[PDB]
């Protein structure tokens, strides 16, 4: 109990000291790693060409202002904190048709190296033609995810893997996944000096 | 890394330095409006409502947001949440459901004092889709303008009268035949002020 009490006091001191950063800039760019864990394709509406997915959106970034010496804090290596208390990236689907619905608490983990990891569960409707879904070749749809207001000079967006995580895809879903991939895309426009980055989520699926 | 620290300190310093009750007749404001139409999602001929998904580009300019880049380590622009600044109340005048925001609501402020704001939106508005299944297709219209500012307080403009269709969903149920955005100034015999609006007119058909 000396034990419980110290861990609590140490955590409170760590947090208090850490919460004493204006987002990324061209002179201070942020690398943001994005990945998806696809749980379910709930619905494909052929009357409006919208498809609804349930997924975890994994986000990882790193900030020098969130570094600490675990030794200075009773060997706390990490803590949990409400995502609303810290800055988060503005990664957004570019072709959604409804506001995203949040299915989970929104809580980040901050590590002593200043890594932040955030994994909200979400349901998203996006523009998608499900024609061919009832055939064996399946249908293919794609949605890009990117920063809303940050160019590739401020937010360098990438993945750890091109493979969307299907290990917990619902085994009795209406739809089975033929493939799910997440790919970095960089676009350069002649008007403009900045690179523009998105992660393109491409899902090939069919009726079970 | 020293470079990283000065970049942060300078932005923070700029933000507190800069941190407006809205425009007046004596201090009016030009708001430039534009649409980037992504999709006509649904056309409901039992209620005469049509659903559009779009980007609504907004741009305005304030002297009170100007700085010299050189006094702040060459910061030429920054991002701030739309709820931390004033924004124009440009609204659809004939919607049938509250507008749904599909994206973060974040503004960019440039050193000359331009503020630019591009929220993604889904809108239901009054529209009769009769004809949509014919070669001539259907035509619908919705006006956008300030809710409480007359043309003496907010001059509403466009850059073009051509809606951006470079991003239109190629497998939408609906094909776009044309899409325009027309600034219209109007005086009423009753009243002294000019009233301005942008008329979004979309002609579309079943793909």
């Amino acid at each position: 109990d000396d034990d419980k009490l110290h861990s609590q006091a140490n955590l409170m001191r760590l947090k208090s000291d850490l919460f004493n950063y204006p987002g990324p800039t061209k002179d201070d760019p942020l690398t943001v790693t994005l990945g998806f864990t696809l749980q379910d394709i709930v619905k494909a509406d052929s009357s409006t060409n919208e498809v609804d997915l349930v997924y975890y959106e994994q986000q990882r970034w790193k900030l020098n202002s969130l570094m600490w010496d675990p030794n200075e804090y009773g060997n706390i290596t990490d803590f949990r904190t409400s995502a609303a208390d810290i800055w988060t990236p503005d990664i957004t689907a570019y072709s959604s048709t409804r506001p995203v619905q949040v299915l989970s608490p929104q809580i980040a983990v901050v590590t002593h190296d200043g890594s932040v990891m955030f994994i909200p569960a979400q349901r998203l409707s996006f523009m998608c033609d499900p024609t061919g879904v009832d055939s064996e070749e399946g249908a293919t749809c794609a949605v890009k995810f990117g920063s809303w207001v940050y160019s590739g000079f401020e937010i360098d967006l990438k993945t750890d893997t091109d493979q969307v995580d299907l290990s917990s895809y619902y085994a009795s879903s209406k739809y089975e996944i033929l493939s799910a991939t997440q790919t970095r895309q960089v676009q350069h426009y002649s008007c403009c000096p900045e690179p523009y980055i998105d992660v393109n989520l491409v899902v090939k699926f069919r009726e079970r | 890394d020293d470079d990283k620290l000065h970049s942060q300190a300078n932005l923070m310093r700029l933000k507190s330095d800069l941190f407006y009750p809205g425009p007046t007749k004596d201090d009016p404001l030009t708001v430039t409006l534009g649409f980037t139409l992504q999709d006509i999602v649904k056309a409901d001929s039992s209620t005469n409502e049509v659903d559009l998904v779009y980007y609504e580009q907004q741009r305005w300019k304030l002297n009170s947001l100007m700085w010299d880049p050189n006094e702040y380590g060459n910061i030429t622009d920054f991002r701030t949440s739309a709820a931390d600044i004033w924004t124009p109340d440009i609204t659809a005048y004939s919607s049938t459901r509250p507008v749904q925001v599909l994206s973060p609501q974040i503004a960019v402020v440039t050193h000359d004092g331009s503020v630019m704001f591009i929220p993604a939106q889904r809108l239901s508005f009054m529209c009769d889709p009769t004809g949509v299944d014919s070669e001539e297709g259907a035509t619908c219209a919705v006006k956008f303008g300030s809710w409480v500012y007359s043309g003496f307080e907010i001059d509403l403009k466009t850059d073009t009268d051509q809606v951006d269709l470079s991003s239109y969903y190629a497998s939408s149920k609906y094909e776009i035949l044309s899409a325009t955005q027309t600034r219209q100034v109007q005086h009423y015999s009753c009243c002294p002020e000019p009233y301005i609006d942008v008329n979004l007119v979309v002609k579309f058909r079943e793909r």
Partner: peptide, 13 residues
Amino acid sequence: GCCSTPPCAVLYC
């Protein structure tokens, strides 16, 4: 884009 790319449009359109 540029104008159909939110972080490009917001600077240049």
